[model samples]
Target: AKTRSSRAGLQFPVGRVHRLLRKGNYAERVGAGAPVYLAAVLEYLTAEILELAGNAARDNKKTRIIPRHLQLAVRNDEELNKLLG
Candidate 1:
């Protein structure tokens, strides 16, 4: 479905994307009756993803999160993705 922006407290380009997800027909696609800031919650979880990424980088004495870090960040987190959308 086509997405639109709610323009609510946008902090980054992804924020705009999320706003789009929460707006107009996109909200209906996700079964939300109106525009909602579920993106805020998703962004918070992404912060956790970044934190785990950073921790893995430090543990391996590397500069960034490798593929394994991505795996680890979401280890056993089945519900995380569900909540994000």
Candidate 2:
């Protein structure tokens, strides 16, 4: 069985998320937890997107993932269109 994490490697830091939002001028003040949620959402989307691209890469019998694989994954997912666009 593939055991899961007990440490790091799969999430964004809240401070970093907050910094990104601040850079974009996304309102005067964002809630403290807002960054946490944004990071969570970003992590989920990133994981999902990578898995899709990974599948596409493996489907082609290749270990290396290419931009085209990511492109295919994004193009196929409906919600991705809105988010990515």
Candidate 3:
């Protein structure tokens, strides 16, 4: 998987996203919009995760978010924690 960076305006591979859905058994013939939607959702999720992780770092009196801070950030949210796992 490629590292998605909002600051760098990088986008994930739509084809790979489609492949993942296929592997997940979502659809044998995926719709055209499926991968597009997935990309948008992923970008949004990345922003949210970073924001939450940044908050966690500040809360812990750290300038940068460590792995543990990210863990705690996700752990504090039911859906996020589940997604992380």
Candidate 4:
């Protein structure tokens, strides 16, 4: 390896993501782009969840996030329910 960026390891690990990809279902070799695409999608969705959870927690007069806040963020959103349910 040549070098490590300051933020390289701070983000997603595509190796583990690759394994997780295969772990779920019948699958063959993971394509070069699959893990990255999955990471991108996961990042966007988590950002959405955090944004909703932040306000949900704030409304409860809370300082930090809890699973209840996260649950409501997923539970209360119809689009997310379609995905999560």
Candidate 5:
């Protein structure tokens, strides 16, 4: 796994996610065009509580973020995969 710094509340593990939201005019794209890499953000998020949220967004459903998803990640066992991935 790798490490990075983020200013937003959403701390991402990958470079592109962090960069897309911080640098490279992400704020504009997000409200204007939904950011091309939104799926990448979901890919980074799809493991714990955010997994379903990512999946839900990927399928273009109601775009609702369930609570169970956050619960999973927040309550996951402490490990490199659990912590980083």
Candidate 6:
């Protein structure tokens, strides 16, 4: 079955991201747009992971992306793999 393209742009809740930072001992006063900045960083990383996983799936002749694709994509990067565990 065909599915809709998953190319939606990034849209993160500012309040939620703000709360997450505050919970992580980041109690310093947050400047305006700080949450937006953090969300952009997350969006960039997420795009990178998805792109790599998609490449892996295509190389393996699969249309659907699987967990192994994501795992291998992260494991393929030395610095990224260390951060995973």
Model 6, 1-85: lDDT tens per residue?
Answer: 2211112234555556777887777777775467767776787777788888899999999999899999998899776688674
Cα lDDT tens digits, model 2, 1-85, are: 2212112333567677778888889898887667767777888898999999999999999899999999998988888867884
Winner on TM-score between 4 and 5 is: 4
Q: Which stretches of candidate 1 lie over 4 Å from their true place?
A: 1-10, 13-19, 22-24, 27-36, 76-85
19-73 per-residue lDDT for model 5 (tens digits): 5666776455444123334534564555443664456455555466666544444
Worst 10 residues of 3 by lDDT: 1-10
What TM-score does each of the candidates earn? 0.52, 0.75, 0.60, 0.72, 0.22, 0.69
Please state every model's RMSD to the true fold in angstroms. Answer: 6.9, 5.3, 5.2, 3.8, 13.0, 6.7
Q: Whose lDDT is higher: candidate 1's or candidate 5's?
A: 1
For residues 1-85, could you state the per-residue lDDT of candidate 3 as single tens digits? 3443232344756667777888899766888577767877897898889999999999999998899988988999888988886
What is the TM-score of candidate 6?
A: 0.69
Ranking by TM-score: 2, 4, 6, 3, 1, 5
How would the candidate models be sorted by lDDT, starting from the highest? 3, 2, 4, 6, 1, 5
Candidate 2 structure, TM-score to reference: 0.75
Residues 1-85, model 1: lDDT tens digits: 2233335452334435445775645434553333335655565677877887778778789897887866765663566445432
RMSD of 5: 13.0
Clashing pairs in 5: 49-69, 49-70, 49-73
The window of 10 residues in a row where model 4 has the poorest summed lDDT is: 1-10
User: Where does model 5 exceed 4 Å of error?
Assistant: 1-65, 80-85
Off by over 4 Å in 2: 1-10
- Candidate 5 Cα deviation (angstroms), residue 34: 21
Better of 3 and 6 by TM-score: 6
Relative to the unseen true structure, what is the C-alpha lDDT of residue 57 in candidate 5, on a scale of 0 to 100?
Answer: 52
